[PDB]
Amino acid sequence: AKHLFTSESVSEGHPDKIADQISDAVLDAILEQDPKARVACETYVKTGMVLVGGEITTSAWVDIEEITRNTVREIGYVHSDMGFDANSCAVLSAIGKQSPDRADPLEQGAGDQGLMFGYATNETDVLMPAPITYAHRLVQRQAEVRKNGTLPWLRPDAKSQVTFQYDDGKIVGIDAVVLSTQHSEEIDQKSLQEAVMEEIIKPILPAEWLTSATKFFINPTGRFVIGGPMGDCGLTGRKIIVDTYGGMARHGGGAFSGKDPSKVDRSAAYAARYVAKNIVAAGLADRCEIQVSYAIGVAEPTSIMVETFGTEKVPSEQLTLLVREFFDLRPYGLIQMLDLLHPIYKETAAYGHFGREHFPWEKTDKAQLLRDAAGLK
Amino acid sequence: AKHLFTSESVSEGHPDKIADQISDAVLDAILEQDPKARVACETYVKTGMVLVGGEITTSAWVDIEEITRNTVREIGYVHSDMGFDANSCAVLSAIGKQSPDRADPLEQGAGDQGLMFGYATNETDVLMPAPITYAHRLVQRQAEVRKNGTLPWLRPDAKSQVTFQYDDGKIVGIDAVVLSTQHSEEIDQKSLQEAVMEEIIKPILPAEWLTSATKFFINPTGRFVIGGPMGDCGLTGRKIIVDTYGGMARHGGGAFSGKDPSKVDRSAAYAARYVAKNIVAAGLADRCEIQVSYAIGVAEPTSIMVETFGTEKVPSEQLTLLVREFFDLRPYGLIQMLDLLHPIYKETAAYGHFGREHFPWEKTDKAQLLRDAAGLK
Ligand SMILES: Nc1ncnc2c1nc(Br)n2[C@@H]1O[C@H](COP(=O)(O)OP(=O)(O)O)[C@@H](O)[C@H]1O
Ligand SMILES: Nc1ncnc2c1nc(Br)n2[C@@H]1O[C@H](COP(=O)(O)OP(=O)(O)O)[C@@H](O)[C@H]1O
Ligand SMILES: [K+]
Ligand SMILES: [K+]
Ligand SMILES: [K+]
Ligand SMILES: [Mg+2]
Ligand SMILES: [Mg+2]
Ligand SMILES: [Mg+2]
Ligand SMILES: [Mg+2]
C-alpha cells in the first residue's frame, strides 16, 4: 500500500551530537588506558561552555579539558563568527572518580534494568532501513564537502530528513527531502542551493528514486549563519532515534554515548542489532525486530521477543530457539561475543551507530550457522 | 502467539525525571505569565547541583532558583542523608532571555523539522498499552504510599518494569515484575519486600494476571539507601520512551519537557495521541499508530502514515482521508485544536504524558464524527 515514512539525521556539530561525541571521546580516552573502566559521562553544551559531568570508576588519568577542545576543533568550531570557538570556550568538569577496590564472570548479572530493541531489513545494501540510511548519508556528505575544501563556505551545523514512499515494502521512491546547512556570510542562498543540490543531494539520493515530483527543501527559511551551541543547547542521548534506525523500529529508553559496555542500554542494543542482522543475512526472515530486556542482578534476559512481520522462512518458535542459542545475551556474554572493551566508540557518535559495516555488531559471521540449524536451505 | 513484551517506568525523584519536572515547572511558571512565550529550557542535575539552561523569549520574569527548589522539595529531597537537599543544593542558571520585538496565523509554518508518532490500542481502559500503564501505576503507587505516611521509610527514587505475556493480542498475564525503591536505613530488606508486595504490587497488578509463575524481583541487589542525584545524573528528555508508550510503538527523536507548544516535537506528538485515540474509540480500528512529520517553514505536514495492523473496520485510504479531515495538523492548528497555551505541563512530567484522561490530547470528543464519516456503524 502506498504510505510515506520519514526519518531525520543531523551532522557532527549539531549541538546534541557535539555532546555525544565529547562523551564518547572521553570514554575512548579512558578505555584506551583502562579497558575495564566503568564510565557514565554526560555532557551539556550551551553558548560559552561545555560541562562534562560524570561518574567514572577507573585507574586512568585523562585530560577532560584537552579531550573536549580537541573534539570541538575536529568538528570545526574554531572562531566566534561560527557561534563557538574550541580554543576559547569554557570547559567545566564535574566527574566523580572512584578508583577500584559470581564464580563464572559470564554469570555476572545486569547492572540496571531495561529494554533494548534491534532491527534489520533486507531493504538496503547494509541491512538497514532506506530512510535513516540516506538521511545519514546526506549529512555525512555535507561534512565531507565541508571538510574537503570543495564547498568551504559550509559551516558545521546541519540537519537532513528524507521521506520515502513505499508500496508495500518496496521503496518506490523519495517524496521529499529537506536539508539545512550553516554557512558563511560569504555565500548567498540561491548560490547555496545550486551547490547543495549538485554536490550534496544529487550524488547521494538514487536517481531512479528522484522524480519530477520530489519536493526538495534546501535551507527553507534559511540563512543559517551562526549555529552549533549559539542559542541551541546540546545534551547527550538526545539524538537517540537518529542514532538507532530513524524510527523504523522501536527503542527502549536508552542512550549510548558516554556509557562503557557494562551498560546494557548500549551493549544489549548493539547485540540485538547483531542478532537481527545475522537472522536476515541467513534468509530466515526479511525484516526482524528483537526486544531483549534485563532485570538488575539477574544475568539471563527476562524476555526475548522476535517479530518477523509475516516475513519468516521458519516459525517464530524455531527462530526464538536459535536466537537464544547462537548468542550469549548475558551482559558479560554479549560483551565477549562482540569484543567490546576497546576504544572504538567516538566513531559511533555521529552518522549512526548501525549500518556502518566495520563495527563488531555489524558482522554477519553467524549467517550460515543460523541458516543450518534453522533447517538448511 | 505467546510472546513477551517489557516496558519500564521510574518515579518522580529518579534524576532524569527531576530534570524533566524542573524544566516543565519553569515552562508552566512562564506560561502562566505569558502564554505565548517561547521556551526551550534544558536541565542537568548532579550531586550538588541543578543547572537550568535555556533559551527563553518572553516578557515574563520568573525566579528560576525558587522554582527549582520548590520542585525538589515536593519530590521530597530535603536532607543530605537522602542524597540531595532542596534547601542547600546549588542552582545555576544559563538562560538566554530575549523579549519579543503569514496572513492566517494558522498557516504559520513549522519551527524545526521532524517526525512524531502516536498510538492507541483497545487493550486498556485508557486506550494505552497494558505494560507501560501498569509500569507507571507501580511507581505512582510507590510515590503515593511514600507521600501518604503509610510506608514512610520509602525515599524518592524508584524504578519499575513489568513484562507481559500476550498470546496474540490478548494480554494473557504477567511473567515478571521488578521494582526497586530507595529506602531509609531504618527498614530491612525482608521487611521491605513484604510491604512493597502488600501495599504497592498487590493492589495494582490485576490478580488474574498474577500467577504462581510470576517472577517478582523487589530490590534485587538492593539496599537502595542514597539515591536521586547522588552518583546518578539527570538530564531532560532522557526518559523519552517512558514518557510515551514503554516502547510498544515507535518514536521520533524528540523530547517534550521544557518545550513550549510551538515545538512540534511536543505538540504534534500530543496531537498524534489525540488522533489515534479518537480513531480507536470510534471503533475504526483496534490498534493505531500514526507518523506525522514536518519540514521547517512548511505548514502542512510533509507525511502522514496510519498503521492499523490488520485491525481496521474501514480501509486505510478512508482512514487517512478522515485523519487529514477532522484534525488540523498545521503547527498552529494543532495548538488551537487542543488549546495548549496554558500552564498544564508540570503534571505531564512524571507518570507519563498519555493515558491520563484529563489532558487535552486524551479527549475522545471526535469519536462519533469519525465513526459517521467513516461509514456509520
Ligand atoms: N531563543 C529560543 N527560544 C526558544 N526556543 C529556542 C530558541 N532558539 C532555539 Br534554536 N529554540 C528552539 O527550541 C527547540 C528545542 O531544541 P531541539 O533540541 O528540539 O532542536 P533539535 O530537535 O534539532 O535537537 C529547537 O528545535 C528550536 O526550534
Ligand atoms: N560511579 C559510577 N560509575 C559508572 N557508572 C555509574 C556510576 N554510578 C552509576 Br548510578 N552509574 C551507572 O551508569 C548508568 C547510566 O545512567 P542511566 O541514566 O542509564 O540510569 P537510568 O537508565 O535509570 O536513567 C546507570 O544506569 C548506572 O548503572
Ligand atoms: K533521549
Ligand atoms: K550517557
Ligand atoms: K527540552
Ligand atoms: Mg536537542
Ligand atoms: Mg538506562
Ligand atoms: Mg539517565
Ligand atoms: Mg527536536
UniProtKB/Swiss-Prot annotation, chains A, B:
The enzyme's E.C. designation: 2.5.1.6
Subunit and partners: Homotetramer; dimer of dimers. The active sites are at the interface between subunits; each dimer has two active sites. (Microbial infection) Interacts with enterobacteria phage T3 S-Adenosylmethionine lyase; this interaction induces the polymerization of METK into filaments that are enzymatically inactive.
Keywords carried by this UniProt record: Acetylation, ATP-binding, Cobalt, Cytoplasm, Host-virus interaction, Magnesium, Manganese, Metal-binding, Nucleotide-binding, One-carbon metabolism, Potassium, Transferase
Cited HAMAP family: S_AdoMet_synth1
Residues the entry annotates as binding Mg(2+): D16
PANTHER family linked to this entry: S-ADENOSYLMETHIONINE SYNTHETASE (PTHR11964)
Entry keyword annotation includes Iron-sulfur: no
UniProt keyword annotation of tRNA-binding present: no
Signals that turn on the gene: AdoMet activates the tripolyphosphatase reaction.
GO MF term list: ATP binding; identical protein binding; magnesium ion binding; methionine adenosyltransferase activity; potassium ion binding
One Pfam family per UniProt: S-AdoMet_synt_N
GO cellular component: cytosol
Catalytic activity: L-methionine + ATP + H2O = S-adenosyl-L-methionine + phosphate + diphosphate
A single BP term in Gene Ontology: one-carbon metabolic process
Domain of life: Bacteria
Native source organism of the sequence: Escherichia coli (strain K12)
Residues that hold L-methionine according to the record: E55, Q98, D232, K263
Impact after mutating D232N: Decrease in AdoMet synthesis
Binding locations of ATP: H14, D157, A158, K159, R223, F224, D232, R238, K239, A255, K259
Result of changing R238 to H/L: Loss of activity
Protein name: S-adenosylmethionine synthase
Chain residues that bind K(+): E42
Pathway: Amino-acid biosynthesis; S-adenosyl-L-methionine biosynthesis; S-adenosyl-L-methionine from L-methionine: step 1/1
